[PDB]
Each structure stands twice: as C-alpha cells, then as structure tokens.
Amino acid sequence: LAVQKVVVHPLVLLSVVDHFNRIGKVGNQKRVVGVLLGSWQKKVLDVSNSFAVPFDEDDKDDSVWFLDHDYLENMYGMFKKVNARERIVGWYHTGPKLHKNDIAINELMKRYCPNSVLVIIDVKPKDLGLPTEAYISVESKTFEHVTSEIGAEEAEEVGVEHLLRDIKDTTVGTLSQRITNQVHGLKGLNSKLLDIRSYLEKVATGKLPINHQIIYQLQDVFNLLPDVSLQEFVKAFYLKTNDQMVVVYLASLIRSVVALHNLINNKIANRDAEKKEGQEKEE
Amino acid sequence: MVLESTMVCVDNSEYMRNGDFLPTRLQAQQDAVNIVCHSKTRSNPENNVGLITLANDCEVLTTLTPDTGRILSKLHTVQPKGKITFCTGIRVAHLALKHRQGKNHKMRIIAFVGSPVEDNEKDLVKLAKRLKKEKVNVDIINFGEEEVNTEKLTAFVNTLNGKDGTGSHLVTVPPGPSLADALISSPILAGEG
Amino acid sequence: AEQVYISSLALLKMLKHGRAGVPMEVMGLMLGEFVDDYTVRVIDVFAMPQSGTGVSVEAVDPVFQAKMLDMLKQTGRPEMVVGWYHSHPGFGCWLSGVDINTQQSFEALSERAVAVVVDPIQSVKGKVVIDAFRLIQALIHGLNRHYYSITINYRKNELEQKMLLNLHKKSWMEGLTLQDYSEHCKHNESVVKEMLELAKNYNKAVEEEDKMTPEQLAIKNVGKQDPKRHLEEHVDVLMTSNIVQCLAAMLDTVVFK
Amino acid sequence: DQFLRDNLEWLARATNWAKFTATASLGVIHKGHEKEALQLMATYLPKDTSPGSAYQEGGGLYALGLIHANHGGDIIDYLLNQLKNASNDIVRHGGSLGLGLAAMGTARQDVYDLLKTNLYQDDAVTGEAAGLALGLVMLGSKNAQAIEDMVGYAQETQHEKILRGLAVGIALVMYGRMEEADALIESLCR
Numbered sequence: 001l002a003v004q005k006v007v008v009h010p011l012v013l014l015s016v017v018d019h020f021n022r023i024g025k026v027g028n029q030k031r032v033v034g035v036l037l038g039s040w041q042k043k044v045l046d047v048s049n050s051f052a053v054p055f056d057e058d059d060k061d062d063s064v065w066f067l068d069h070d071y072l073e074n075m076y077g078m079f080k081k082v083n084a085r086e087r088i089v090g091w092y093h094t095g096p097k098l099h100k101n102d103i104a105i106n107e108l109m110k111r112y113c114p115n116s117v118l119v120i121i122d123v124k125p126k127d128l129g130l131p132t133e134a135y136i137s138v139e140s141k142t143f144e145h146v147t148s149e150i151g152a153e154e155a156e157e158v159g160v161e162h163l164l165r166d167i168k169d170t171t172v173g174t175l176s177q178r179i180t181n182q183v184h185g186l187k188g189l190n191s192k193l194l195d196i197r198s199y200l201e202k203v204a205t206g207k208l209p210i211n212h213q214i215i216y217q218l219q220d221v222f223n224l225l226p227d228v229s230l231q232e233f234v235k236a237f238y239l240k241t242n243d244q245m246v247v248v249y250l251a252s253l254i255r256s257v258v259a260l261h262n263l264i265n266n267k268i269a270n271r272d273a274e275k276k277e278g279q280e281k282e283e
Numbered sequence: 284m285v286l287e288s289t290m291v292c293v294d295n296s297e298y299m300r301n302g303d304f305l306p307t308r309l310q311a312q313q314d315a316v317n318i319v320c321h322s323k324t325r326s327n328p329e330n331n332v333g334l335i336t337l338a339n340d341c342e343v344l345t346t347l348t349p350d351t352g353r354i355l356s357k358l359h360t361v362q363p364k365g366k367i368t369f370c371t372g373i374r375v376a377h378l379a380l381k382h383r384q385g386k387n388h389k390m391r392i393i394a395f396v397g398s399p400v401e402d403n404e405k406d407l408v409k410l411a412k413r414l415k416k417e418k419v420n421v422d423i424i425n426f427g428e429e430e431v432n433t434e435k436l437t438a439f440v441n442t443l444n445g446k447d448g449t450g451s452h453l454v455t456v457p458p459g460p461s462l463a464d465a466l467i468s469s470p471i472l473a474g475e476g
Numbered sequence: 477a478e479q480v481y482i483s484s485l486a487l488l489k490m491l492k493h494g495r496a497g498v499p500m501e502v503m504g505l506m507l508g509e510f511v512d513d514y515t516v517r518v519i520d521v522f523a524m525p526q527s528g529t530g531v532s533v534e535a536v537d538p539v540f541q542a543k544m545l546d547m548l549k550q551t552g553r554p555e556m557v558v559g560w561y562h563s564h565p566g567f568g569c570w571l572s573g574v575d576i577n578t579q580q581s582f583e584a585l586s587e588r589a590v591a592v593v594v595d596p597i598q599s600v601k602g603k604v605v606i607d608a609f610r611l612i613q614a615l616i617h618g619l620n621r622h623y624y625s626i627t628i629n630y631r632k633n634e635l636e637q638k639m640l641l642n643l644h645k646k647s648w649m650e651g652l653t654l655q656d657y658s659e660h661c662k663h664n665e666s667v668v669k670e671m672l673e674l675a676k677n678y679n680k681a682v683e684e685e686d687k688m689t690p691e692q693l694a695i696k697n698v699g700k701q702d703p704k705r706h707l708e709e710h711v712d713v714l715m716t717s718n719i720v721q722c723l724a725a726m727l728d729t730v731v732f733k
Numbered sequence: 734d735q736f737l738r739d740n741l742e743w744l745a746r747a748t749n750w751a752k753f754t755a756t757a758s759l760g761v762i763h764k765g766h767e768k769e770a771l772q773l774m775a776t777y778l779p780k781d782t783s784p785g786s787a788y789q790e791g792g793g794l795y796a797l798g799l800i801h802a803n804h805g806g807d808i809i810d811y812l813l814n815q816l817k818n819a820s821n822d823i824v825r826h827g828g829s830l831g832l833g834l835a836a837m838g839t840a841r842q843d844v845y846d847l848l849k850t851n852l853y854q855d856d857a858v859t860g861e862a863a864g865l866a867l868g869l870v871m872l873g874s875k876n877a878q879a880i881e882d883m884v885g886y887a888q889e890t891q892h893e894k895i896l897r898g899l900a901v902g903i904a905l906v907m908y909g910r911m912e913e914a915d916a917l918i919e920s921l922c923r
Binding site: 009010011014015017018019021023048049052054068071074078081082083123125129147149150152153155156157158159160161163167168173175179181182184185227233240243244246247248251252254255258 | 483484485487488490491492493494495496520523524525540543544547550552553596599600602603604630633635636637638639640641643646647648649651652657661664668671675704707708711712714715716717720721722723724725727729731732733
C-alpha cells in the first residue's frame with residue numbers, strides 16, 4: 001500500500017515528449033496530459049508505459065476542464081490486449097509545476113486505478129536533470145513529493161545506449177565519475193538555499209501568509225546544523241583521515257611498484273630487440 | 284441532415300428532482316433525450332452529443348459518442364435535487380465541443396433547465412458570445428418556475444444568434460405532458476437542426 | 477540510396493515490446509510518411525496483440541487497427557501505416573517466407589511499405605541491431621534473392637538526448653552523502669588484508685617466471701591467477717573509494733556548518 | 734562512339750539514370766567540339782523526340798554543356814528557358830544539371846533564380862542540380878543571400894539530397910572567400 005521510491009523508465013519520457021511536440025502545445029499557456037501504466041502493487045512504483053490523453057482547459061484560469069473518460073476506457077483495454085501486465089496507474093501533465101485542477105482530477109483517476117500517481121515531465125529540459133518529479137496525494141489532501149529515478153530495463157539499456165551513444169560520457173573509471181557527481185550535488189544545494197531564501201523574502205514581502213509549518217522546519221534545519229570545530233570532532237576527523245592515509249600510502253605506493261616492474265620488462269624488450277636487429281645488420 | 288457535435292446538458296435539480304410530467308421531470312428528460320438523440324443519430328449517423336452535469340459538481344456524464352453509449356451512460360441517476368452549473372456546465376459543454384470528434388462536425392448543445400438558473404447576463408452572453416465565437420448550435424430545454432424566461436435564457440438564444448441554428452434556437456418547455464409532441468414544434472428538434 | 481528515418485520514441489517502443497515478448501515473434505505497425513522515392517519516415521508505432529500462433533497475415537487485426545487509428549486521430553497522430561515491425565529473437569534479421577507473404581499483403585496496400593525486423597536478445601547494449609527492407613547469415617534466406625536490404629537513420633532532438641543523459645545520472649541529495657564509515661573501514665582493513673596474501677603471489681611470480689617466455693607463460697597464467705592484475709585492480713578500489721570518502725568529508729565539514 | 738556502337742544492347746542494359754548517364758557521357762567524348770556537340774546531342778537533344786526514356790532525353794541536357802561549359806550559355810539559357818518553361822523531373826534535372834555547368838563562374842541570377850524554383854520545386858531528382866548550378870553560377874564570393882536561402886532551404890527544405898547539395902552550392906559560392914564564409918562555415922560546423 002504505502003510506497004516510497006518511484007521508478008520510471010525512459011520510454012515514458014520520450015513518449016510524453018513526442019506528445020508535447022506532436023501536439024504543438026505551447027509551454028507558456030498550455031500543457032500536455034496523458035496516463036501511465038506500470039506496476040503499483042508493491043511499496044515502490046515501477047512505471048513503464050504511457051499514452052496521450054486529449055483534454056481541454058477552461059480558457060484562461062480554468063475553473064472547469066474536460067478529460068475524455070471514454071477515450072481512457074476505450075484505449076486501456078486496447079492496451080490490455082497487448083501486454084496485460086501493465087496496469088493503469090496514474091496520469092501526468094508536462095506543465096512545469098503542478099496547478100489547480102490537478103488535485104481535483106487525481107480524484108477522478110481514483111475511479112480507473114487504485115492509488116493513482118501524478119508525475120510531471122519537464123519538456124523544456126532547460127533546467128538541470130531529472131525532468132520528472134513524482135507526486136501522490138495524501139490527507140486536507142495535498143501532494144506528497146516522492147523521489148524518482150530513471151531505471152533502464154534491458155531493452156531501454158540497449159535503446160538509450162545505441163542512441164545517446166553519440167552524447168554519453170566517455171570517462172568511466174570511477175574517480176572522475178564520483179568527483180563529478182559531487183560538484184553536481186554542490187550546484188544542487190546552492191539552488192535549494194536560494195529557493196528558501198527569496199521565498200522567505202516573499203514571506204516578508206510577497207504577502208507571506210505564515211506557513212508556521214515551514215518556519216518550524218527551517219529552524220529544525222538550523223538545529224541540525226553540525227557546528228563545531230569542537231575538541232571532539234577535530235579529533236574524530238583527524239583520527240579518520242590518518243586511516244585513509246595508511247590505505248593510500250599503500251595503494252599508490254605498491255601501484256608504483258607495478259609500473260616500475262612493467263618498465264623493467266620494457267627495457268628487456270628493447271635490449272633484446274637491438275641485440276637481434278644489430279645482429280641482423282651483419283647479414 | 285446534421286453533421287455536428289452536440290451536448291446534452293441535464294440539470295437534475297430543483298425541477299428534475301420533481302416530476303414535471305411522467306414520471307419525473309428528470310425522467311421526462313430521459314426518454315425525450317433518446318427520442319431527440321435518436322432523431323439526432325437519425326439526422327445523420329455520426330451525429331455526436333455530449334452529456335454533462337453541472338450543479339454543485341459540474342461534470343460530463345458521458346461524452347463524444349454516437350449510438351447508445353449515451354443512452355447507456357444516461358441510464359444512471361444523478362444528484363436529483365442539484366443546482367445550476369449551467370454557465371460552467373455550458374462553458375464545459377463548450378470546451379467539450381472544442382474536442383468534438385472528427386470535426387466538420389459543427390458545435391451543438393441541448394440543455395434541460397431543471398434549475399432556478401442563477402447566472403449574470405454578461406457572463407451568460409459572454410457564453411453566448413463564446414458560443415457564437417466558437418460557433419455552437421444552441422437549443423435549450425426549459426420548464427422553469429414561472430418558467431426560466433424573461434431572463435438570461437431569452438436574451439441568450441438571441442445573444443448567441445447571428446444565424447439561428449448555426450448559433451441558437453430556443454424552446455422554453457410548457458407545463459403538462461407531450462414533450463416529444465411539444466418539442467416537435469420547437470427547433471430543439473426538426474426545423475433547422 | 478534509399479533510407480528510412482526512425483524516430484527515437486519509435487525505436488524505444490520497438491525494443492521494449494520485442495524484449496517483452498521473448499520469445500514469441502511479436503508484431504506491430506509503423507506510422508509515418510513517405511517523403512520521396514528515396515525516403516520513408518517512421519515517427520510512431522503501436523503494438524499488435526498476440527495469438528495462438530506466431531506472426532502472420534491474420535495476426536494483423538483490423539478491428540484493433542482502425543480502433544487504434546481513430547483513437548490516435550483524436551490525438552493528431554494522423555499518418556499512414558508505412559510498415560510493420562516484427563521480431564526474430566535469437567535468429568538475427570531476415571524474413572522467413574511466411575514473413576514474406578505478409579510483407580506482400582503490405583505491398584498491395586502500399587507499394588513502398590517496408591518490413592522491419594528487430595532482434596531483441598542479441599541486440600547488445602552497444603549498437604542495437606535493427607533491420608528494415610523490402611521484397612522483390614541472411615543470405616541463406618536469399619537476402620538479395622527474394623528481397624533486398626535498406627538503410628536506417630534516426631531523427632533527433634537536442635532535448636530528447638538531454639532527457640536520456642540523466643538516465644545514468646545520480647540523485648539529488650547525492651554527492652554530499654557519506655557512506656557508513658565504520659563499514660568503509662572494513663573495506664580498507666579487509667581489502668588490504670586480501671591484498672597482503674597476494675603481495676607474496678606477485679613475489680613468487682617474479683622470482684619464477686623471471687626465467688621463462690610467453691608460450692611457457694600461457695601454461696602458467698591461463699591456469700592460475702597472476703597477482704599482477706590483482707594488486708593493480710585492487711589498488712583501484714582503495715584509491716578512488718578512499719579519495720571520494722576523504723573528499724566528501726572535507727566538503728561536509730567546511731561546507732555544512 | 735566506338736563501344737557505343739559495339740553494344741547497342743548496352744542501352745538495353747542501361748537504366749533510366751544510366752540511360753540518362755549514357756546520354757551525358759557523350760559530351761565528354763565530344764568535349765572541345767564547340768559546334769558538333771550540339772549536333773552530337775541533336776538526336777538526343779530536346780524537342781527532337783526520342784527513342785525512349787526522358788532521361789536519355791534529359792541526358793543530352795547535362796551532356797551538352799560538358800563540351801560547352803562557359804561557351805553554351807545561350808543554349809544553356811535557351812535550355813534554361815526549357816527549364817524555366819517547366820522545371821521538374823529529368824526534363825528539369827538533366828537540364829538543371831547542364832545549366833550551371835556552362836553557367837558556372839558566370840553570375841546569372843536567373844541561373845540561381847530559375848533553379849531556385851526548380852530547387853524549391855522540391856524534386857529530389859531536379860531540385861538537387863539546382864543546389865549545384867546555383868552554386869556554380871555564383872561560384873566566387875557569390876552572395877550571402879542565396880547562402881541564407883540555401884542555408885535556409887537547407888534547414889527549410891525537406892529532403893536528404895535537395896538539402897544536401899545546398900551546402901555544396903554553399904561550398905561553391907564561398908570560394909577563396911576564406912575568412913568570409915567562416916560564419917556559414919561555423920554555421921555549417923555548428
């Protein structure tokens with residue numbers, strides 16, 4: 001029932017995109033919508049397939065909307081006839097963030113599924129990665145944010161690799177990858193902090209209502225702030241770093257021995273080589 | 284005859300909750316619909332209609348189709364004492380017709396007035412405008428208290444209307460039975476369709 | 477000179493359905509447009525249901541087909557049926573005669589309709605195997621006799637790719653995360669220990685092989701595990717794993733404060 | 734015509750384009766006959782009917798200028814008239830070929846222009862040659878507008894070949910310009 005981590009296959013991404021540019025839907029005053037098939041049973045949600053849903057918003061500032069229920073229950077079973085294992089889960093709108101009628105219509109999809117999920121594909125990509133963001137609705141009744149991932153099934157491994165090949169990263173090893181992932185995280189951090197910062201401004205300006213529930217959490221962020229080049233920590237880190245030095249003093253070192261040995265072998269090949277060549281130069 | 288999409292607007296409401304002639308108004312609505320829609324699908328096959336509920340919870344009660352699936356859909360009830368979503372319902376019915384299937388189908392709407400009809404004239408006419416803008420055919424079923432008339436509904440059919448059936452034609456339903464007989468007169472059916 | 481362009485969504489839907497059907501040669505239809513006599517473009521695909529029997533003419537389901545067609549019309553995906561995919565898992569890319577007859581049943585619909593064979597299993601992660609071609613390893617079936625091959629390319633977008641990049645990315649809270657230290661220490665204590673036993677191995681191989689050749693060498697090292705690739709490979713983990721952990725802390729201490 | 738006579742069934746074994754090509758391979762053979770060539774092409778020229786295949790008929794067109802390159806402008810423009818009169822298919826390609834052939838290095842907007850439609854007429858057959866001859870006409874520093882056009886038509890016009898030969902034309906009318914085309918170069922690079 002209660003689920004935590006959400007998994008997504010890249011085919012819903014590309015599919016939804018092609019829905020976007022297929023239907024020419026402006027990214028300013030308009031969004032795209034379709035539904036999502038996958039496995040909702042366990043405490044994760046594996047999303048696999050999707051298909052586009054025709055729908056209308058009510059002029060500007062939509063009070064009402066329309067989504068075709070007949071289109072759904074006509075398509076659904078026409079998917080069942082293909083792979084029966086893919087169950088109708090939830091829907092998506094490609095619109096940057098959530099909206100108004102969202103929470104209203106999810107209640108609608110509770111008719112055609114059980115739990116019902118809503119994720120938002122970012123079609124612009126102009127931001128950083130994870131164009132998706134996963135949401136459910138819990139009581140009140142708002143959208144809880146969930147973690148997501150892009151989990152390539154074998155077929156999508158093959159697909160994405162054949163394609164993205166001409167764009168992938170060529171540096172593998174392990175050190176470059178990790179040290180990259182970090183800085184990527186640092187950039188991430190700096191972003192979130194902005195967000196909270198200027199918001200609080202809007203709190204002090206942007207007609208900040210109150211949200212005593214956020215401010216509490218900010219405080220709790222400070223209370224969790226590790227201070228303290230304390231005589232305690234200063235030792236912990238110190239005692240730890242040294243352990244790391246011992247491991248490094250071995251790896252780097254012995255490794256150097258391995259190069260040395262290899263060099264020796266090369267000199268062996270050269271020496272033997274000139275002997276036979278100079279030998280041949282005789283006749 | 285007709286190649287256009289239609290919408291059936293049903294108020295199940297303070298009138299529909301209440302028999303205006305057998306068995307209930309809301310029921311009197313029903314077979315009249317099929318009657319209509321039959322002639323609608325007899326007008327042409329492919330003639331499509333919507334079905335939607337307004338009140339405190341406006342929504343489609345079935346949409347798009349062209350055959351029985353509506354008669355299917357309409358089969359089940361509604362909130363019987365409900366209230367006006369008309370404007371919204373219509374504005375939905377408009378957007379409905381914005382997605383009407385395999386266009387070259389003109390936009391049409393058929394509306395039961397089972398509600399006291401609360402709305403503002405401009406909004407009403409903004410609808411009428413929006414319709415005429417969208418170019419919707421609009422005919423209304425109204426038996427109101429008094430009736431709902433000398434009102435929005437009267438301005439509206441006018442306000443929608445440059446050309447009659449390309450925009451609007453009215454009938455305001457009278458007290459008593461013979462609905463199919465009654466409306467046989469009104470350009471809710473026949474005449475220009 | 478003739479060619480087809482296969483959009484990304486097509487190819488991924490393709491490989492997905494194929495890889496899902498193992499091993500009953502599924503089938504589906506291809507939506508696209510014929511640019512000129514030298515081109516076919518496939519922008520879309522939808523999947524055709526299975527049957528008590530493999531792919532064949534009647535496997536094509538008219539009810540299903542049109543039922544999908546109009547459904548897509550409502551979504552503005554209007555496009556001819558330009559070809560039909562298929563899969564021959566494990567048997568490479570070619571048309572059986574039974575594949576052929578059906579291909580004809582798509583000739584008389586449009587003379588330029590093509591056949592696309594996908595091969596889910598062999599299709600490696602590197603260069604996905606795909607083949608498209610039309611009638612008149614594979615040469616056993618008359619690659620050039622009854623039919624003939626075509627060429628393929630892929631219509632792209634700078635964004636599409638951008639989504640796919642994050643495919644093998646990480647998370648958010650990632651980069652600042654510090655794996656369980658104590659547990660890490662075991663890797664260095666346990667990893668270094670395992671290497672120790674190897675250290676002597678490398679010693680014995682240098683003192684031994686020191687007096688031999690490569691042919692004699694294959695007898696030694698095809699048998700056992702030389703400790704060379706173990707020390708160098710083993711040092712890899714300690715190096716980077718330790719550096720990342722050391723580096724991660726260095727940042728958390730200064731940054732997080 | 735030594736072997737040309739040898740196999741006449743050669744022509745049978747030629748194909749519409751080969752038939753088209755076999756007809757053009759004549760201008761080569763006669764290249765430097767500044768009178769005969771036209772008469773050489775005469776039997777295979779235009780209006781003078783044909784034994785079969787408008788390509789062979791198309792063949793002379795391109796085949797013609799082979800001898801007359803720079804010297805056939807009249808016939809060229811004349812043929813360009815035939816082009817102008819109807820730009821499309823072989824009747825426009827083979828001509829669309831030989832036009833810029835003789836028109837090469839000579840700046841004639843019509844050559845650019847007349848093709849520019851034949852170009853824009855979007856015959857993978859025909860429009861291709863336009864992507865060349867237009868380059869050939871303005872072969873030189875040319876004009877950036879055609880470049881824009883070509884480059885536009887490149888991104889604009891939807892075809893592999895028709896789109897392809899454009900850059901070639903772009904390659905043409907950027908000649909010795911060096912530093913100049915770097916933009917489009919960079920553009921083309923990008």
